[PDB]
Amino acid sequence: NNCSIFVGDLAPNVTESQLFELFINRYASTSHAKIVHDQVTGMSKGYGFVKFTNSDEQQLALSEMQGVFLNGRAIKVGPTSGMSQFIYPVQQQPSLNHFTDPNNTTVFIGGLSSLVTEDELRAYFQPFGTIVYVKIPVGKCCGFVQYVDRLSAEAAIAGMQGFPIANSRVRLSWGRSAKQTALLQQAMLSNSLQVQQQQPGLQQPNYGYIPSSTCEANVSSTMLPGCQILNYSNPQQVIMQGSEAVVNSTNAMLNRLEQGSNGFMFA
Amino acid sequence: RGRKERENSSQNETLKVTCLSNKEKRHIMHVKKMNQKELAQTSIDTLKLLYDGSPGYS
Amino acid sequence: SKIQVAHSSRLANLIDYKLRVLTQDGRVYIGQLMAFDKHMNLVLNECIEERVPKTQLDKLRPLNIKVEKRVLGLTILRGEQILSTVVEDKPLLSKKERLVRDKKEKKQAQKQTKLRKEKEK
Amino acid sequence: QSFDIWKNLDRIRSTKKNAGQFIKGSLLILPMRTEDKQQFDECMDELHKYISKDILRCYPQKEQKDEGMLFYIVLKDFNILDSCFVLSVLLAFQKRLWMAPSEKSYFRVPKNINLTGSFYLPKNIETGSSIVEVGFNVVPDFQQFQVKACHVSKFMNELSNFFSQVEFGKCEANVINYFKREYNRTYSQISLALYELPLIGDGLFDIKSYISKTRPIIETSKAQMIKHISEMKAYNEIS
RNA sequence: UUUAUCAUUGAACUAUAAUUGUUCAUUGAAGUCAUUGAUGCAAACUCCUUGGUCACACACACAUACGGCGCGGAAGGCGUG
């Protein structure tokens, strides 16, 4: 619930530790407490906020601290939050499946003919973005393509939909990883919870990375914003983006054409 | 009024009048007055807080 | 304009009439007077200022005349650069209704003086 | 129909329902570019022998690049037929130099060529297909109009259907010099932008402060990326 | 229908001007927006404020031209206490 109480008219010799001792551990459990001090002087202005988890304990603390002796003066611990037309919109949650997760960047591919390999399936989904693994289940005619970016997954689904691989139309949707699929199979065999977990984020902001950018290959980088600074390596580590990237990619694609004209690789 | 307007209007239908008590209309008109004054006093202030880190904000 | 302006009235009696006041230029102001003074400085409610252009003046010299009207609202005009004033349009409420309104204003003013005498005690 | 200009000119004179009246307050500007001048001069002398001086005027450049010239062709107070004739001749000539260097006829258009061009008009237009408008024009005052991939008769019919619907009027007097100054200013800006292309690294970006301004930040971002890779490896691990 | 800045010079120039006129430009002082602008002309549609939206009747009067001989309201003139 996180009920907030606003203590006011406090004394000057009352720090955040004394307010946390007077708020928490007295028939309640205050989650946070912060006294609003001055911006440049450092002295307290006499006001402070205390946010607790339960609303009943915060209401009991506000009813018990109404007029209590706080450093020689009153506490005034009445609540701050909790007929206008304008109210903020409130929403429920979609219970966190693998469709309604905005951080879910792995695409479930199906409808295969049990004939495509892993390197060839990497070669289908390589220029859409950087990639981490292309492993597929055996005998299940399906697979998993996990990117790093979500816009790369959007481009992959918007381009690769309706594309027949080996005379067999593709089915693109969302899905979890292999460990989460094993956890869902273990929780669905007994049918107790069958709860999923959200995919972890990127610990944003990230100034250096540019989305939907691939690089296969000393480095004197100027770190200019028009170019690229950092990138994810192709398996995996973090590489500094050099200037001789399009040259190495051109040499790599010419080598790929030379080795694919003969039959040394099918991808 | 005209005759044929009276034979047309008194035969179509009879509508229902809604009406409220004294405290209900008083509370509703007081809420409408506070809404009219809070709309007359408000203004959109999105461009001030949306360009807050702009180099010409100062 | 069949208004029949009063035959023995002055500026104290012509108050709240929709005047059509003429100036030295001819910039005619139309509006209700609400006050005057010794120099004939006239405030004008819902006033409009009308002129004629220089091209329309040739047609006006011996029919339709396209006057230029600007809206001033509540203005206060000086008595130096004015020439003549007439009464164009009658007000909304009548003489008996203004008499009842003036009696209500007198009774309200006497009640306000009784309230000031009660607050002074 | 045919590949001749004059037969389509007779056809467009015939069945356009008294199209002899010109447009009041009409203006068109066609800026074109030629590799050489001597081949252009004979065709322009033939055009001035065919089209009068009051209708069409020509404006040279200042010879700043010395290789690519820029010539303005301003059609002022023109009729609908002379506009089609001038645009057909110029759109044939500025592509015949690349396609047919051995045909040698300034008024006979072959069949292998398609007419595709771009011409400016003033903003005060009222239209109330092969010729389209543009979005995000580069000129502040004028509107760019595009024609693409047409034969001779389709070019005639489309230009006549375009000028039969549009309504011009009230152009500014020395708007030609205004367009000249604005066009030269815009393309001098993009030429200066191409001049800024070798000056990216260490030239004019204050690299000495920009390295120290972003030296801890890229390191912390790289640490966040390494933490993201390690957390992804822990997330995909069965164990 | 009518206007949308001047001056010095360069390559020609009509030329009594502070090269006025014609094509191109460097520079110098202010530099209304408006050209879908301004003036004149002309029609149609729509919407706002006002009323006695009143009492009887859907009626054969008048050269002294019109029975002003109902209940009022709005503006005004004249006369009396």
Curated annotation (Swiss-Prot), chain A:
One of its GO terms (biological process) is mRNA splice site recognition. The keyword Metal-binding does not apply. Residues 3-82, 105-177 form the RRM domain. The keyword Isomerase does not apply. Signal peptide: none annotated. Keywords: mRNA processing, mRNA splicing, Repeat, RNA-binding, Spliceosome. Present with 1480 molecules/cell in log phase SD medium. This is Protein NAM8. The chain holds residues 161 to 523 of 523 of the full protein.
Curated annotation (Swiss-Prot), chain B:
It is found in: Nucleus. Present with 2140 molecules/cell in log phase SD medium. U1 snRNP is composed of the 7 core Sm proteins SMB1, SMD1, SMD2, SMD3, SME1, SMX3 and SMX2 (Sm proteins B, D1, D2, D3, E, F and G, respectively) that assemble in a heptameric protein ring on the Sm site of the small nuclear RNA to form the core snRNP, and at least 10 U1 snRNP-specific proteins SNP1/U1-70K, MUD1/U1-A, YHC1/U1-C, LUC7, NAM8, PRP39, PRP40, PRP42, SNU56 and SNU71. YHC1/U1-C interacts with U1 snRNA and the 5' splice-site region of the pre-mRNA. Component of the spliceosomal U1 snRNP, which is essential for recognition of the pre-mRNA 5' splice-site and the subsequent assembly of the spliceosome. YHC1/U1-C is directly involved in initial 5' splice-site recognition for both constitutive and regulated alternative splicing. The interaction with the 5' splice-site seems to precede base-pairing between the pre-mRNA and the U1 snRNA. Stimulates commitment or early (E) complex formation by stabilizing the base pairing of the 5' end of the U1 snRNA and the 5' splice-site region. Belongs to the U1 small nuclear ribonucleoprotein C family. This is U1 small nuclear ribonucleoprotein C. It comes from Saccharomyces cerevisiae (strain ATCC 204508 / S288c) (Baker's yeast). The gene is YHC1.
UniProtKB/Swiss-Prot annotation, chain C:
Residues 98-108 have a biased composition (Basic and acidic residues). Disulfide bonds: none annotated. A motif (Nuclear localization signal) lies at residues 95-121. Residues 6-91 form the Sm domain. It comes from the Eukaryota. GO terms for biological process: 7-methylguanosine cap hypermethylation; mRNA 5'-splice site recognition; mRNA splicing, via spliceosome; spliceosomal complex assembly; spliceosomal snRNP assembly; U2-type prespliceosome assembly. It is found in: Nucleus; Cytoplasm. C-terminal extension may function as a nuclear localization signal (NLS). Plays a role in pre-mRNA splicing as a core component of the spliceosomal U1, U2, U4 and U5 small nuclear ribonucleoproteins (snRNPs), the building blocks of the spliceosome. Present with 861 molecules/cell in log phase SD medium. Component of the Sm core complex, present in spliceosomal snRNP U1, U2, U4/U6 and U5. The core complex contains SMB1, SMD1, SMD2, SMD3, SME1, SMX3 and SMX2 (Sm proteins B, D1, D2, D3, E, F and G, respectively), and is probably a heptameric ring structure. SMB1 specifically interacts with SMD3. Belongs to the snRNP SmB/SmN family. This is Small nuclear ribonucleoprotein-associated protein B. It comes from Saccharomyces cerevisiae (strain ATCC 204508 / S288c).
UniProtKB/Swiss-Prot annotation, chain D:
It comes from the Eukaryota. Transmembrane segments: none annotated. It is found in: Nucleus. Component of the 18S U1 snRNP particle, a subcomplex of the spliceosome. Interacts with the nuclear cap-binding complex CBC1-CBC2 (yCBC). Directly contacts intronic sequences of substrate pre-RNA. Present with 361 molecules/cell in log phase SD medium. Component of the U1 snRNP particle, which recognizes and binds the 5'-splice site of pre-mRNA. Together with other non-snRNP factors, U1 snRNP forms the spliceosomal commitment complex, that targets pre-mRNA to the splicing pathway. This is 56 kDa U1 small nuclear ribonucleoprotein component.
